[PDB]
């Protein structure tokens, strides 16, 4: 199956409360394995998975320096971007960075990512060819020109295609008991009366990994999409995920509504019915 | 500045069975900025020992957090999640439904 590694960096400025808040987290497809918080009691990269802990002290001493370097740049980027948009230091602002790589089922490189955001909107992003950038406005083009001279696109392409991928494979092998295992969802339905002539069929899916899943309600084969309550895939707190879909079925028609569940852990897509 | 309203989901890690310990989850997602107050309520009172996950965001740069606490539900205790954000005038409270 396909995999991916992605790191997430959030820097929120505190005007009167001192240095900006910096949070860094790293994932493997849905599994957080590292964290860093500038306000945490530990100023080192802390592990969140058992398979990342088998790395020697040289790994953590290195990843601590790198994550401290990201915080220093975001601390500077906050002031730089504040000047680009001629903004006052009277308020707080948000700088978010995300980068990583995707691999296909053959574990070959599939796509690379490197993106910035300022105050919740896209600021600059590395394009698919891993050679050019996308600059939103003049402030972003200033950054684009600065990164072109520094040869930043070339450094990422060597990392996204060569290091992000190679170390993803190392993480997969070290956590094959966890990351390469697929836990199929446990499906069930619930029936609840809402009126004298209407009822609520809620199609459930719990304890599955990864979080990619698809819940669909059909009526006589037609996809019920406009009238179908769907909730965002939520975490359970132990590593698995949950999701449910609901439709308001008139009394007596429950027999012609069908729920469809698609997931990587299912050999064939499930078709659930009431009665 | 861009502001996005948080989406709230109150639920439990395991199917609620009165008398057995479980985890009460409140998953706030799709909001911006990250400054947000999330408290878990038991019969209207705030629960003290409440832990949260690490801050992360989605494809569209919207953050998400999971606030959880260990509890033991009963047939009479009512639980709710109170979330206050810059996009909400009055703090929103979502009661815990056993079937949602």
């Amino acid at each position, epitope marked *: 199956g396909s995999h991916s590694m992605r790191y997430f960096f959030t820097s929120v400025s505190r005007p009167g409360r001192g240095e900006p808040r910096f949070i860094a987290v790293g994932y493997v497809d849905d*599994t957080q394995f590292v964290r860093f918080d500038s306000d945490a009691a530990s100023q080192r990269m802390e592990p969140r998975a058992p398979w*990342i802990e088998q790395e020697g002290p040289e790994y953590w001493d290195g990843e601590t320096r790198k994550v401290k370097a990201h915080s220093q740049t975001h601390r500077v980027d906050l002031g730089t971007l504040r000047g680009y948009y001629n903004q006052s230091e009277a308020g707080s602002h948000t700088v978010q960075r995300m980068y990583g790589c995707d691999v296909g089922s053959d574990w070959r490189f599939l796509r690379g990512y490197h993106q910035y955001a300022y105050d919740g909107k896209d600021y600059i992003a590395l394009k698919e060819d891993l050679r050019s950038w996308t600059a939103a406005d003049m402030a972003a083009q200033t950054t684009k020109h600065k990164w072109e001279a520094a040869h930043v696109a070339e450094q990422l392409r060597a990392y996204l295609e060569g290091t992000c991928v190679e170390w993803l494979r190392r993480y997969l092998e070290n956590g094959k*008991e*966890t990351l390469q295992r697929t*836990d199929a969802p446990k499906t069930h339905m619930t029936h609840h009366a809402v009126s004298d002539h209407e009822a609520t069929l809620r199609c459930w899916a719990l304890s599955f990994y990864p979080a990619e899943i698809t819940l669909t309600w059909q009526r006589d084969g037609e996809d019920q999409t406009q009238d179908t309550e769907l909730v965002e895939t939520r975490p359970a707190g*132990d*590593g698995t995920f949950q999701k449910w879909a609901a439709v308001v079925v008139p009394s007596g028609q429950e027999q012609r509504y069908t729920c469809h569940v698609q997931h990587e852990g299912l050999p064939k897509p499930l078709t659930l019915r009431w009665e | 500045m861009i502001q996005r309203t948080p989406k709230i989901q109150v639920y439990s890690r395991h199917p609620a069975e009165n008398g057995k*310990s479980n985890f009460l989850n409140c998953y706030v997602s799709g909001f911006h900025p990250s400054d947000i107050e999330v408290d878990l309520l038991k019969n209207g009172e705030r629960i003290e*020992k409440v*832990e949260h996950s690490d801050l992360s965001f989605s494809k569209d740069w919207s953050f998400y957090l999971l606030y959880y606490t260990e509890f033991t539900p009963t047939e009479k205790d009512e639980y709710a999640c109170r979330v206050n954000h810059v996009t909400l005038s009055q703090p929103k409270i979502v009661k815990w439904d056993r079937d949602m």
Partner: T-cell receptor
Amino acid sequence: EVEQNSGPLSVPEGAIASLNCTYSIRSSTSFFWYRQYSGKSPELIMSIYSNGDKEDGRFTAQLNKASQYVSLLIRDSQPSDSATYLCAVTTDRSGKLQFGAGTQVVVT
Amino acid sequence: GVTQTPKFQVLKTGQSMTLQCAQDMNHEYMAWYRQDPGMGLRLIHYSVGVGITDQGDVPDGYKVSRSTTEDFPLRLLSAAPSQTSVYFCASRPGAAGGRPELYFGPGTRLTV
């Protein structure tokens, strides 16, 4: 790896039996206490997940993720508590439960 | 909830018996542990589903089969003096997503 006392802890009747275990995997999330009488099977008596203390009956389990050690306190030790107590630790989304050597308690 | 067949069974050196285990709780995860004075419960093998076996901490010298959700028997190829231990069987509702508490069987004392 889970290290325990690995020795008979003699606690008089009515005292507080205190045994502890240390785990190696820092990212562990679930911690359990199993008691096992001589010849019988281990049964789950206490499970703690959040950093702090948790009491249920005469049993009290403490968790300290900073020092990476779990302890268990037995208030009002009785001869019915004389058994080997096993400490089990696990990580998220995993079925490999790591059990310690066990600490035998002999209450008179 | 969990039952094991060979209560207090003695074996020989060559081509010994195979210990059986079963549970009527429709559990996905099942495991075999070994208990020795001074070492504790040591994982032999575990299965997270039907036809899905995996090796634990001491897989050298053991073969396990998982053909049904209920039965999870532990086989012994050839008995060694190191096989003298008490074999326990455990299970839990699922490999993940459920309550991680483990249910143990009555056990099996064995000497060589």
